[PDB]
Design an enzyme around this catalytic site. Structure first.
Site, PDB file in Angstrom:
ATOM      1  N   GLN D  10       0.821  -1.226   0.000  1.00  0.00           N
ATOM      2  CA  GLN D  10       0.000   0.000   0.000  1.00  0.00           C
ATOM      3  C   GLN D  10       0.844   1.261   0.000  1.00  0.00           C
ATOM      4  O   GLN D  10       0.618   2.132  -0.851  1.00  0.00           O
ATOM      5  CB  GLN D  10      -0.926  -0.019   1.215  1.00  0.00           C
ATOM      6  CG  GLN D  10      -1.964   1.087   1.153  1.00  0.00           C
ATOM      7  CD  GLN D  10      -3.252   0.735   1.850  1.00  0.00           C
ATOM      8  OE1 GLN D  10      -3.308  -0.206   2.636  1.00  0.00           O
ATOM      9  NE2 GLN D  10      -4.299   1.490   1.563  1.00  0.00           N
ATOM     10  N   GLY D 143       2.368  -6.948   6.497  1.00  0.00           N
ATOM     11  CA  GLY D 143       2.690  -8.365   6.266  1.00  0.00           C
ATOM     12  C   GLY D 143       3.196  -8.666   4.873  1.00  0.00           C
ATOM     13  O   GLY D 143       4.241  -9.317   4.734  1.00  0.00           O
ATOM     14  N   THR D 144       2.488  -8.194   3.857  1.00  0.00           N
ATOM     15  CA  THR D 144       2.887  -8.507   2.465  1.00  0.00           C
ATOM     16  C   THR D 144       4.148  -7.734   2.062  1.00  0.00           C
ATOM     17  O   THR D 144       5.013  -8.322   1.405  1.00  0.00           O
ATOM     18  CB  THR D 144       1.733  -8.242   1.495  1.00  0.00           C
ATOM     19  OG1 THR D 144       2.080  -8.757   0.209  1.00  0.00           O
ATOM     20  CG2 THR D 144       1.381  -6.776   1.379  1.00  0.00           C
ATOM     21  N   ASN D 227       3.831  11.712   0.453  1.00  0.00           N
ATOM     22  CA  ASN D 227       4.246  10.986  -0.765  1.00  0.00           C
ATOM     23  C   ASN D 227       4.825  11.950  -1.799  1.00  0.00           C
ATOM     24  O   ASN D 227       5.768  11.571  -2.506  1.00  0.00           O
ATOM     25  CB  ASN D 227       3.059  10.230  -1.342  1.00  0.00           C
ATOM     26  CG  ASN D 227       2.574   9.131  -0.427  1.00  0.00           C
ATOM     27  OD1 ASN D 227       3.207   8.813   0.578  1.00  0.00           O
ATOM     28  ND2 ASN D 227       1.444   8.538  -0.774  1.00  0.00           N
ATOM     29  N   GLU D 253      28.043   5.074  -7.421  1.00  0.00           N
ATOM     30  CA  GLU D 253      28.888   5.915  -6.546  1.00  0.00           C
ATOM     31  C   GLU D 253      28.263   6.073  -5.156  1.00  0.00           C
ATOM     32  O   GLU D 253      29.022   6.197  -4.183  1.00  0.00           O
ATOM     33  CB  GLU D 253      29.111   7.274  -7.198  1.00  0.00           C
ATOM     34  CG  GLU D 253      29.874   7.187  -8.503  1.00  0.00           C
ATOM     35  CD  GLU D 253      30.168   8.551  -9.104  1.00  0.00           C
ATOM     36  OE1 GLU D 253      29.666   9.555  -8.556  1.00  0.00           O
ATOM     37  OE2 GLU D 253      30.895   8.611 -10.116  1.00  0.00           O
TER      38      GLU D 253
HETATM   39  N1  LIG Z   1       4.325   7.555   4.195  1.00  0.00           N
HETATM   40  C1  LIG Z   1       3.361   6.662   3.924  1.00  0.00           C
HETATM   41  N2  LIG Z   1       3.129   5.653   4.786  1.00  0.00           N
HETATM   42  C2  LIG Z   1       2.149   4.780   4.463  1.00  0.00           C
HETATM   43  C3  LIG Z   1       1.398   4.874   3.336  1.00  0.00           C
HETATM   44  N3  LIG Z   1       0.478   3.846   3.295  1.00  0.00           N
HETATM   45  C4  LIG Z   1       0.686   3.135   4.388  1.00  0.00           C
HETATM   46  N4  LIG Z   1       1.709   3.657   5.142  1.00  0.00           N
HETATM   47  C5  LIG Z   1       2.218   3.173   6.424  1.00  0.00           C
HETATM   48  O1  LIG Z   1       2.746   1.870   6.295  1.00  0.00           O
HETATM   49  C6  LIG Z   1       2.240   1.027   7.356  1.00  0.00           C
HETATM   50  C7  LIG Z   1       1.190   0.084   6.841  1.00  0.00           C
HETATM   51  O2  LIG Z   1       1.774  -0.779   5.870  1.00  0.00           O
HETATM   52  P1  LIG Z   1       0.884  -1.304   4.642  1.00  0.00           P
HETATM   53  O3  LIG Z   1       1.495  -0.888   3.344  1.00  0.00           O
HETATM   54  O4  LIG Z   1      -0.547  -0.892   4.789  1.00  0.00           O
HETATM   55  O5  LIG Z   1       1.040  -2.892   4.771  1.00  0.00           O
HETATM   56  P2  LIG Z   1       0.768  -3.856   3.523  1.00  0.00           P
HETATM   57  O6  LIG Z   1       1.961  -3.799   2.628  1.00  0.00           O
HETATM   58  O7  LIG Z   1      -0.526  -3.463   2.872  1.00  0.00           O
HETATM   59  O8  LIG Z   1       0.639  -5.302   4.213  1.00  0.00           O
HETATM   60  P3  LIG Z   1      -0.795  -6.017   4.387  1.00  0.00           P
HETATM   61  O9  LIG Z   1      -1.622  -5.213   5.353  1.00  0.00           O
HETATM   62  O10 LIG Z   1      -0.575  -7.407   4.903  1.00  0.00           O
HETATM   63  O11 LIG Z   1      -1.438  -6.055   3.022  1.00  0.00           O
HETATM   64  C8  LIG Z   1       1.682   1.992   8.387  1.00  0.00           C
HETATM   65  O12 LIG Z   1       2.714   2.442   9.245  1.00  0.00           O
HETATM   66  C9  LIG Z   1       1.164   3.126   7.519  1.00  0.00           C
HETATM   67  O13 LIG Z   1       1.193   4.319   8.262  1.00  0.00           O
HETATM   68  C10 LIG Z   1       1.629   5.926   2.433  1.00  0.00           C
HETATM   69  O14 LIG Z   1       1.002   6.073   1.399  1.00  0.00           O
HETATM   70  N5  LIG Z   1       2.645   6.822   2.770  1.00  0.00           N
HETATM   71 MG   LIG Z   2      -2.369  -4.323   2.502  1.00  0.00          MG
END
Ligand SMILES: Nc1nc2c(ncn2[C@@H]2O[C@H](COP(=O)(O)OP(=O)(O)OP(=O)(O)O)[C@@H](O)[C@H]2O)c(=O)[nH]1
Ligand SMILES: [Mg+2]
Ligand SMILES: Nc1nc2c(ncn2[C@@H]2O[C@H](COP(=O)(O)OP(=O)(O)O)[C@@H](O)[C@H]2O)c(=O)[nH]1
EC number: 3.6.5.-
Lengths: 430, 72, 42, 442
Positions: D10, D143-144, D227, D253
């Site tokens: 995500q 997790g993923t 982002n 580098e």
């Molecule tokens: N800076 C930033 N942090 C993000 C963003 N989306 C999620 N996070 C952060 O990343 C963490 C959540 O990780 P996710 O990416 O939702 O986890 P995932 O890869 O979807 O893993 P699963 O839930 O098993 O599918 C939290 O700390 C969120 O605050 C984003 O767009 N920008």
């Molecule tokens: Mg997810």
């Protein structure tokens, strides 16, 4: 990711009617089944709760089971009743008699096979199946016995999915039935082994919500079932709408359950305020956060101030900043640090979804894992021991066929559940 | 159980000296300074003993070589 | 409790990869090597 | 010449949306992949080629993969405004998430999806003639991202071998938190990431929230702001491959200059002219002012204080109207400061880069338009403080096996917790040992 719902007994069918009304309203489905919505965001996840029938129609993935058809004739007569598939109504010819043994052993084994055929037919149609959702009361007769029978069979047939339950449990003050302790004890014994996540609601908490928060002069069961349908429809919102931080039932379970027996949770929904007062206070993240932890808005009689939070989860709906959520959850954890279990470094999970419920700018639903739930089970166990020592009404259950050893096993298992919660309440780092 | 006033709802600045989860780190550093000092002492002792064994081996070699030279 | 004690005992005895002493001995061997190979005092 | 971007989960896909929006607007590619009819004339140019390839009819398509186990975020990119830019094969989505379990991503679910990812990366690598690295964006809290990111980096490291892999990683913030199981996922991810990554850049949302409150005037920021800042950082680092400059810096580098020992590859990042449009026209923004800005911890995008440690190497990238003499004067002034300290075994601590292209302005953005900017990535021993608090939180939770039954049921041996915790203990001892003064040997 499709959910299958099961509604059992009078309470389950009544709550289900309002739940499917709320879900049909948010996705703009007419009581005839036609889609009349006004944004593509509504259509792109319609599959999650509805199957598509030919020429436009949608049908809801729900199984209705009851031992006397009176309730089913009432729901079929209701304003949205037509949407339900006729083949999904399963009923017998004689009532449960408020007796757990009849519902589990005599009419249960007679009807259960037709329910398993319908549940398998519904499950195998999904391209990918998510967990089941069940609504029933534990104090009744067919709800407790046949619901737990079906839960055991579905756990045998689908052990890798999630099992989620919403359950109504008897108030300590407002009893509706004399034999409530037996049915409740046997049902809790079945649930603690079979369930993955169980939510508990007290009717006294809904009455206190209506009188103190909403100031309703003459509340009715329709209001209580609307509050329950609102919270039930809120937990799944991140499954079926876009958002900045998606969430899922399995991810909720992984963050909420530290140990497999500790899967009993408290529920709350924040934006509750009377029609006279609503003109005087705007919605904002601090107001929702302040109401969310107020015990007045929590749906069980046990109070959080007598226990400790192991874990909690908050799902936010609406266009809002992530910074305010993070800083609010930090501020509540820091100022009230004594009420949070110290061996977990962060107890709250947050999630954010872009689409709020219709008519509200923003909303949050709260799920809490708190040790104060031990007080309800202790009260049920005391009333059970008072009734069991004198064989107060046992001949009904023994005449249906139950062995006395089941009652001692169910009592022992509930006592061990209370002990395990009490031990984690008083645990220390040392 | 109070959430406090609205003006105190903001983010507290991070101060790693008062972070409760980093105290073993600072204790480890405070032990590490004396550990380094005693390691230096042990190192110089080992260097001295290595020099001593080298000297003894040199003396033994010189004795053997002079004996091997005088036999002719 | 006994498992936790065993794991703590194991964890407190872990060994790092790089050492000041290893670099020190390799340096004071290379020192005499350079002095031997050099043709002007060093 | 070319670089391939891998976006996982995500955070990685949402940061990818901001990155590709910026790269399109800076090169001038429209959201449908074409260019205006009057932008074709002029001198014959190809600078976009590092990130886009042309079919011959003039459409551009990007060298990226988007990986997720849940469909929602990828379905949102598929249904959004940039639908025609991406190749449909590039957007890969599974059926269900890893539910914050590293074990579910690594053992049960990622093993089915990993072969499609490797086939797509192979299809990209066959259409290149000067590939110079993989860029990876993921979060270690979920997790993923942890499980499939580790499994895919292991397979890539076996198949492609020596090619460099640079990671941008979102670590769990020190007091803002989103999920309970973050320590387990971050420890288990970091165990795999230690062996299979060349440089890892760490980001914390709490730092970018602090930066958006102090410098910009935003009271209620959201992930799109963070982002867009990350996209600006990535554009600054990759500008050295794409535009003319006095001192260019190839992607190899960074790895050669920043990593002294093969395990010591975690670096801090900061960005200087974060300023609002109303403040920007009352003050000059000279080289020395932004150079002084990059060293205050209030400017950093990671929550660590560098005054509690020592720097080992710094890489300073300047883009825009800068002259080398001002960079030399600024670096000499920084070196004079008493609150900036370098380890005594690193006397020559700096690498410089100078590029002529000034930073691009995005229509909905919140940064002002400015003629010059500097971005820094640096390796410092203060980062050891970040691992110690996660390790302490792991020890607190693991003392009672607080959630272990999920991991053991989903397919993982209990032994894996002890192995990862021992490896992170050795990494902490490495950072303790490397920071020991060489003086006083006699
Ligand atoms: N800076 C930033 N942090 C993000 C963003 N989306 C999620 N996070 C952060 O990343 C963490 C959540 O990780 P996710 O990416 O939702 O986890 P995932 O890869 O979807 O893993 P699963 O839930 O098993 O599918 C939290 O700390 C969120 O605050 C984003 O767009 N920008
Ligand atoms: Mg997810
Ligand atoms: N909240 C709520 N409780 C209900 C509703 N209908 C019945 N109940 C409660 O559920 C219990 C009766 O259980 P019932 O559904 O009749 O059990 P059954 O005979 O096995 O179906 C009593 O405590 C009722 O007060 C309803 O619509 N809403």
């Amino acid at each position: 990711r499709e959910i299958v719902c099961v509604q059992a007994g009078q309470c389950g069918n009544q709550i289900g009617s309002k739940f499917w009304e709320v879900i049909s309203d948010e996705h703009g489905v007419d009581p005839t089944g036609t889609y009349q919505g006004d944004s593509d965001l509504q259509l792109e996840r319609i599959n999650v709760y509805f199957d598509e029938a030919t020429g436009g129609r949608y049908v809801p993935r729900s199984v209705l089971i009851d031992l006397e058809p009176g309730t089913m004739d009432s729901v079929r007569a209701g304003p949205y009743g037509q949407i339900f598939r006729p083949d999904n109504f399963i009923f017998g010819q004689s009532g449960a008699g408020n007796n757990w043994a009849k519902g589990h052993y005599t009419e249960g084994a007679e009807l259960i096979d037709s329910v398993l055929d319908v549940c398998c037919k519904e499950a195998e149609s999904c391209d990918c199946l998510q967990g089941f959702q069940i609504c029933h009361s534990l104090g009744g007769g067919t709800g407790s016995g046949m619901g737990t029978l079906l839960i055991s069979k579905l756990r045998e047939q689908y052990p890798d999915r999630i099992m989620m339950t919403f359950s109504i449990i008897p108030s300590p003050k407002v009893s509706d039935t004399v034999v409530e302790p037996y049915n409740t004890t046997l049902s809790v014994h079945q649930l603690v082994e079979n369930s993955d996540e169980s939510m508990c609601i007290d009717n006294e908490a809904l009455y206190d919500i209506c009188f103190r928060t909403l100031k309703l002069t003459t509340p009715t069961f329709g209001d209580l079932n609307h509050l329950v349908s609102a919270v039930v429809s809120g937990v799944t919102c991140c499954l079926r709408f876009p958002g900045q931080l998606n969430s899922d039932l399995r991810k909720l379970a992984v963050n909420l359950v530290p140990f497999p027996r500790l899967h009993f949770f408290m529920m709350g929904f924040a934006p509750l305020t009377s029609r006279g007062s609503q003109q005087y206070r705007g919605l904002s993240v601090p107001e929702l956060t302040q109401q969310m932890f107020d015990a007045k808005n929590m749906m069980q009689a046990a109070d959080p101030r007598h226990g400790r939070y192991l874990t909690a989860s908050a799902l936010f709906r609406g266009r809002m900043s992530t910074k305010e959520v993070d800083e609010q959850m930090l501020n509540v954890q820091n100022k009230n640090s004594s009420y949070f279990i110290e061996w977990i470094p962060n107890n709250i999970k947050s999630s954010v979804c872009d689409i709020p419920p219709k008519g509200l700018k923003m909303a949050v639903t709260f799920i809490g894992n708190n040790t104060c739930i031990q007080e309800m089970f202790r009260r049920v166990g005391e009333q059970f021991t008072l009734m069991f020592r004198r064989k107060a009404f046992l001949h009904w259950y023994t005449g249906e066929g139950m062995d006395e050893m089941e009652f001692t096993e169910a009592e022992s298992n509930m006592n061990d559940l209370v002990s395990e919660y009490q031990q984690y309440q008083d645990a220390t780092i040392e | 159980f109070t959430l406090g006033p609205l003006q105190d709802q903001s983010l507290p600045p991070y101060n790693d000296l008062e972070d409760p989860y980093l105290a073993p780190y600072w204790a480890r550093r405070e032990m590490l300074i004396r550990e380094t000092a005693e390691r230096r002492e042990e190192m110089r002792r080992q260097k001295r003993l290595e020099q001593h064994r080298r000297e003894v081996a040199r003396r033994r070699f010189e004795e053997r070589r002079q004996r091997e030279l005088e036999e002719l | 409790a006994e498992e936790n004690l065993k794991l703590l005992h194991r964890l407190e005895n872990v060994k790092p990869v790089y050492r000041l002493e290893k670099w020190e001995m390799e340096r004071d061997e290379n020192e005499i090597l350079v002095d031997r190979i050099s043709r002007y005092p060093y | 010449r070319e670089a391939i971007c891998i976006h996982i989960g995500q955070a990685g896909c949402q940061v990818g949306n901001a990155c590709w929006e910026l790269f399109c607007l800076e090169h001038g590619i429209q959201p449908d992949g074409a260019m205006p009819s009057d932008k074709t004339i002029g001198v014959e140019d190809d600078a976009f080629n590092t990130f886009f390839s042309e079919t011959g009819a003039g459409k551009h398509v990007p060298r990226a993969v988007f990986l997720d186990l849940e469909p929602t975020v990828v379905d949102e990119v598929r249904t959004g405004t940039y639908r025609q830019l991406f190749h449909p094969e590039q957007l890969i989505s599974g059926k269900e998430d890893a539910a914050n379990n590293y074990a579910r991503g690594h053992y049960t679910i990622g093993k089915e999806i990993v072969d499609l990812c490797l086939d797509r990366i192979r299809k990209l690598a066959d259409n290149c003639t000067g590939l110079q690295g993989f860029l990876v964006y993921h979060a270690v809290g979920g997790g993923t991202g942890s499980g499939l990111g580790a499994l895919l980096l292991e397979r890539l490291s076996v198949d492609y071998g020596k090619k460099s892999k640079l990671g941008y990683t979102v670590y769990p913030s020190p007091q803002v938190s989103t999920a309970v199981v973050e320590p387990y996922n971050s420890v288990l991810s970091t165990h795999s990431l230690l062996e299979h990554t060349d440089v890892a850049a760490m980001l914390d949302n709490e730092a970018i929230y602090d930066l958006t409150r102090r410098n910009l005037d935003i009271e209620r920021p959201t992930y799109t702001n963070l982002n867009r800042l990350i996209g600006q950082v990535v554009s600054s680092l990759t500008a050295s491959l794409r535009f003319d400059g006095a001192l260019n810096v190839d992607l190899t580098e960074f790895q050669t200059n920043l990593v002294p020992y093969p395990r010591i590859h975690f670096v801090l990042t900061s960005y200087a002219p974060v300023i609002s449009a109303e403040k920007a026209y009352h003050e000059q923004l000279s080289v020395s002012e932004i150079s002084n800005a990059v060293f205050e911890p209030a400017s950093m995008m990671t929550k660590c204080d560098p005054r509690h440690g020592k720097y080992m190497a710094c890489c300073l990238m300047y883009r825009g109207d800068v002259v080398p003499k001002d960079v030399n004067a600024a670096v000499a002034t920084i070196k004079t400061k008493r609150t900036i300290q370098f380890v005594d075994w690193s006397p020559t601590g700096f690498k410089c880069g100078i590029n002529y292209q000034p930073p691009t302005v995005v229509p909905g953005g919140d940064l002002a338009k400015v003629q010059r900017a500097v971005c820094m990535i640096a390796n410092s021993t203060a980062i050891a403080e970040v691992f110690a608090r996660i390790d302490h939180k792991f020890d607190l939770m693991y003392s009672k096996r607080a959630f272990v039954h999920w991991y053991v049921g989903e397919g993982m041996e209990e032994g894996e917790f002890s192995e990862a915790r021992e490896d992170l203990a050795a990494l902490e001892k490495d950072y303790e040992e490397v920071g020991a003064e060489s003086a006083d040997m006699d």
